[model samples]
Target: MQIFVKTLTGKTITLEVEPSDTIENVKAKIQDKEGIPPDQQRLIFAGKQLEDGRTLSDYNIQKESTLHLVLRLRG
Candidate 1:
């Protein structure tokens, strides 16, 4: 599956992660891509806040569905 991650810094990074990747793993990937810390990351899918420990399946995400990530920036 592919997820579309959009950062507040005007960065759009598309990651090719597996369906098994939970929100937690996604956060790690975001941290790596956006150079942001986990605590400073905000992940949103389908306009809903994603919580750790929840898999993509938990949110009823369709197979091959695109995930939208909104990364909050520090002032």
Candidate 2:
């Protein structure tokens, strides 16, 4: 399924991903394009954080949703 990703900066990107892919898989894809590693990228859909092991379908995330990308804070 294709979707939109928005960063905290208000920058947006288009992504085409598989429905069966988990949140980690989506993070991996984001890492390549946004230069943020999977471990440092936090994904939220409809006010909920997406777990690495769960697929988008598991989250009941539909196609064309605007996913919010929050960066992990480092010490």
Candidate 3:
């Protein structure tokens, strides 16, 4: 399974992860690419935060669908 994600900057990235991967893994992957601190990362989808340690399916997320993520940059 794959998770397609959209950053707050409007950049799109596709992560080819297994269906069993946890939400935390996705969070870490995006944080690495977007330079978002864990504390500043908001992994919200469908109007709610993605549950930690839960699989993508738990959130009813679909392939080619987008997960909403935002980061508050500290200037």
Candidate 4:
């Protein structure tokens, strides 16, 4: 399955992943491309936060759907 990942910079990247993959798995892939750590990446879909323990299918993510990426700012 494929999903569109939108970054805070308004850039979009297409990721080829499986529904069984965990959110952390997705973040790892994004880390390779965007240089952001998994711990700092916040993924949201359908206005809900995606947890690392949950798989894409668990969240009912569909093919070609969009996932927004937000960076956590530390004070």
Error of 2 at 15 (Å): 1.0
| Model 2: per-residue Cα lDDT over 14-66, one tens digit each | 78988888999899888878898888999999999889999988987778988
Evaluate model 1: give its TM-score. 0.76
Clashes (N, CA, C under 3 Å) per candidate? 0, 0, 0, 0
Model 2 TM = 0.91
The sequence of per-residue lDDT tens digits that candidate 1 reaches over residues 1-75 is 776777766667777777767888888887887777777777777788888888877887655555565655778
- In candidate 3, what residue range of length 10 has the lowest lDDT sum? 65-74
Clashing pairs in model 3, backbone N/Cα/C closer than 3 A: none
Winner on TM-score between 1 and 4 is 4
**Higher-TM-score candidate of 1 and 2:** 2
Which candidate number maximizes lDDT?
4
Of 1 and 4, the candidate ahead on lDDT is 4
CA lDDT, every prediction? 0.74, 0.88, 0.77, 0.92
Per-residue accuracy of model 4 over 3-65 as CA lDDT, tens digit each? 899987889999999989999999998898889899899999999999998999999998999
In the range 1-75, model 3's lDDT, one tens digit per residue, is 777778878888877776667888888888787877666777887777777678877877777757888774667
